[PDB]
């Protein structure tokens, strides 16, 4: 995250961190239930063998409530390709269930129509992660969060060199130099509705980070709810 704020105690409990063999975070994830993590399909190319870290806010300090979970099943969307970045979604089934506690809790999955008419129409959402704090930088050791305005679909397409599909959405600032970055990929984009946080997006990509006239591109969670629901039955 470029700019923004640190996630304080219990603020971003649905954040999951994908860690490679070297125990270094490379992508985010969203906790959906005790056995399921939502992430980006393109994250599955960043490492051969990976684990899921939950309850982590600071990668330097071995916390309390912090736990490592091995992946049993990787459920990748067969329509994903690096040429388009379309269908940038995956679901992970863990070997062992997550223990919910302070800093460990799932985000809600909304119903499609309500998410589109009510959540997507709010002014802002919140993106979080352990990604780069500057376009040129190292992975953050601290979990950050950033309130991001929803961007009008027309402005979103005009802003981009690449094709913005119906499975994607824009969020961010045109001038303010704060946004998600590399390493935030797969992480949560949540929208608050009456003190309840619903998962609305998956950090997918962007042209650099926090660039003026550019935005964060997210996988639209509403477009894959049945596919997500189905994945959790297996």
């Amino acid at each position: 995250i470029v700019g923004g704020q640190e996630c304080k105690d219990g603020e971003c409990p649905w954040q999951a961190l994908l860690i490679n063999e070297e125990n270094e975070g490379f992508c985010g994830g969203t906790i959906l239930s005790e056995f399921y993590i939502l992430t980006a399909a393109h994250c599955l190319y960043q490492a051969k063998r990976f684990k899921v870290r939950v309850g982590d806010r600071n990668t330097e300090q071995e916390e309390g409530g912090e736990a490592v979970h091995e992946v049993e099943v990787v459920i990748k969307h067969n329509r994903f390709t690096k040429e388009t970045y379309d269908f940038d979604i995956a679901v992970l089934r863990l070997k062992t269930p997550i223990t919910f506690r302070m800093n460990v809790a799932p985000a809600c999955l909304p119903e499609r129509d309500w998410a589109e008419s009510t959540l997507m129409t709010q002014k802002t959402g919140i993106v979080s992660g352990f990604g780069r704090t500057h376009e040129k930088g190292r992975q953050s050791t601290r979990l950050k969060m950033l309130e991001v305005p929803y961007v009008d679909r027309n402005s979103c397409k005009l802003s981009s060199s690449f094709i913005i599909t119906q499975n994607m959405f824009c969020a961010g600032y045109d001038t303010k130099q704060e946004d998600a970055c590399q390493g935030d990929s797969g992480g949560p984009h949540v929208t608050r509705f009456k003190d309840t946080y619903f998962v609305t997006g998956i950090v997918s990509w962007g042209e650099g980070c926090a660039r003026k006239g550019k935005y964060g591109i997210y996988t639209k969670v509403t477009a894959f709810l049945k596919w997500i629901d189905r994945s959790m039955k297996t």
Partner: protein
């Protein structure tokens, strides 16, 4: 107006059925007797910050 007027007074999901507001909740919540509020069924319900 129904669901377009303050989410039909629902805590979470709002649906229109037979020109009336119908509220529902996410898993781990139960719809309250007033048919509007969503009550957590146990600890760590989805979408709640763990600030306590």
């Amino acid at each position: 107006k129904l669901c377009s007027l303050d989410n039909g007074d629902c805590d979470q999901f709002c649906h229109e059925e037979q020109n009336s507001v119908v509220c529902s909740c996410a898993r781990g919540y139960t719809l309250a007797d007033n048919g509007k509020a969503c009550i957590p069924t146990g600890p760590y319900p989805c979408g709640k910050q763990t600030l306590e």
